[model samples]
Target chain A: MSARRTESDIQGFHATPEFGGNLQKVLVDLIELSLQGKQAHWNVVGSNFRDLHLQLDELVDFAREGSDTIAERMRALDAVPDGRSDTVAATTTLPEFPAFERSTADVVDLITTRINATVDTIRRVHDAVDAEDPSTADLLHGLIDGLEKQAWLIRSENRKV
Target chain B: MSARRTESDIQGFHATPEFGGNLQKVLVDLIELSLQGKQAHWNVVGSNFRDLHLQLDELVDFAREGSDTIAERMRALDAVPDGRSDTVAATTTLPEFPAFERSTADVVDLITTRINATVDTIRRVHDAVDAEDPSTADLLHGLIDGLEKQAWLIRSENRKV
Candidate 1:
């Protein structure tokens, strides 16, 4: 459930319904991802504390922007973007980020895994959305690239000097 | 520059020139921001180390995603997105994030300031691009929201418990 839908030319767009559904799913994942990043941001520890702390903030920002753009794309198509906390709580398919894993490598590994998983979901949506709507597909495609890039950035820290 | 311009309905789009230029600017800023976030992530020290360490990661992710999305948007519009480190080094307008500030609160405060500054620049771009291209404007608008959310997330930690 979301706010009332608005009128838009996209109402008749063939992919509108499917795109809205997929966008909503990614939006939920991103909302949960942001909160998880914040949680890690507040709790990471160890010799690598500085690196993990700062890196987590970047992940949080990525999730926040991804959610915003996906939700907005939904609105552009006359669909209500469901971002309510409870809604996200119930809908996100990504596993909970471990609260107890505080080491820099541990936290980095956890977030990297999650980012890759989320990319998988986004890519799944990409092919479906692409067939009916390249514009919306473009948005999801961008998300996949971002998630992969973030994954690479964090994984880089996991390697020994 | 870019690969050959793909034919699109948006060709000759009113704000194409302005959007391309502004996108380039933000791309540079984002690249710099990611490096700064990594710098903070790697070097932060003190009792609040755990929190700051993880927190900086989120910021790094934010900058990476911002750069990726902006670059992709440029490609969408038949423009090449420049993300070379040297180019970012030469072009980013944001003040350097202090390398010596190791305290948790000081780094948090510094990042908060930079996030706000970046948001201000993005907003300025938003208006110009909006006048010529709503789609690109939407991208900047989403960036603004993400930056503000990152700012608030960090500022929250700066406040007294």
Candidate 2:
């Protein structure tokens, strides 16, 4: 275990030492997703404007809520929840939300991919958190459930059937 | 200590036993808020139709996300999180949101009050959870923080200088 502790460390945690770091990564992804959703919200146009815009708001809200929870959990564990734009840009593995997609359908497709990608990343880390902290795993499980719903909402708009 | 343990009992919790009950109340309040906000979204009209409709979407999203978190936390504790409509109707302390308020400013004002009211209820429970379950308290703090911002955004719209 690294003896170096930042200003945010607290006590009484029984998980593997890297739990905070892992959660921080989740936080960064959520922030990225939130920003991307807002980008789509602000730019989406075309015939589906009303539905698309409202849907994006829901998606953004979900991401923002998730980010808040993940960050707070990190703070509870005594780590700083870094949501600064620079930090997110530096570490986020998800692709940029295509701001150029002004059409509602295109924007929906772009956001759907990003949401699904983030879900995959969160799930990848779920097992590690499950082994180390079942509580955090449960939190991630809730997030995954919500994100899947978000992805479906946007993706359904792109469906022709 | 009551020797009776319902199916909701889980292991590894050191907090005062009432934690689950308190969180269930929060969950119910959130569900009520989400439904109310959606009602506002579908009915709001006037010159501010576009902005108010979008704003209501965000508010609804916030409440829905909050309800999910509170419910998941209850589940983590092995407690059933009751968010059924009948349960919310019977328990929510919030006043009915006037679905007839079609004007943008009127709906905004209505939502602002409800948002603030929910914030007040959440904060009242904050101390109890803080004393018993600091982790849960941390989650409540984040929700309160976001809800306050949501309330401010709506309330600000009602201001006319």
Candidate 3:
């Protein structure tokens, strides 16, 4: 990695329990979001299905991107990455996506809520990360911006377009 | 986040300097790639500019996704995150993208090479990561697949079309 020794590089995260706790939480919701977005991508049916299907790719990619950012930070901080199948299933606070086929309108709402939930997780950790490590705080805010962009797009899909 | 204590969760990364070294390298190059992709996205001009612009978004997003994944792992392993501009500028192994405006064909080659360099960086640490943590090995492999997908499309852009 580029310059691994910047602010909070050496034992920086290890020094703070609150920072570690907040960072771990965001990674789980993010990993869950990535999987759920894909779940919707494959199962949605009906009007605007094609566009929704394609747009889902962007959301999924961004979510994965979001998750990775958090996981890397977790590692940097000596917190260990989260996201095993059982772990995600057991602990994610985000709303679940169904295994069965989902209507275009119905899935949009589901996906939107999940995105909102993810933003909630980010917000949950925002102040803690900011307090513990401003660098991380800056990082999670970008995720909020990216996730919300997708949230706005998906939620608006129900607008009779 | 969701259960933060899975494989290599604790001090799994801290035990070996080799694993730490390899993980840090990949993270740096990825952050560099994200920035370069955006550089091209904004400054790119001429034929197919709009499509290339949109496509650049996906590549940059994925690169960031890739970076976050690695950085989070770095943090998990007790290694610090590494995306400060100076760090990336000082240490990235990827090729440089020009600051001035770039033509469609010119930028395509530039972007493609930088991506190849990234995969090269990923490959550089593949075995070490695979040896140290099979979980991360599995993770990096997914990135190689996603990145190559984008590389193929970007390189082919220089075609006679």
Instruction: Name the candidate that leads on lDDT.
Output: 3
B119, model 1: CA deviation in Å? 0.9
Give per-residue CA lDDT, model 2, range B1-161, as digits (tens). Answer: 12111222111232345887788778877888899999999988887688788988998888898888777666544456788788999999788876475788888878888888788878888888766644466578778998999988888888989
Q: Pick the candidate with the highest TM-score.
A: 2
Q: Lowest summed lDDT over 10 consecutive residues: which window, candidate 1 chain B?
A: B1-10
Cand 3, B chain, TM: 0.88
In model 2, the runs with Cα more than 4 Å from the true position are A1-161, B1-10, B14-17
Error of model 2, residue A130, in angstroms: 24
How many pairs in model 3 have backbone atoms within 3 A of each other, for residues 3 or more apart or on separate chains, i.e. clashes?
Answer: 24
Cα RMSDs of all predictions? Answer: 16.2, 15.4, 17.4
Q: Chain A only: TM-score of every candidate?
A: 0.86, 0.88, 0.89
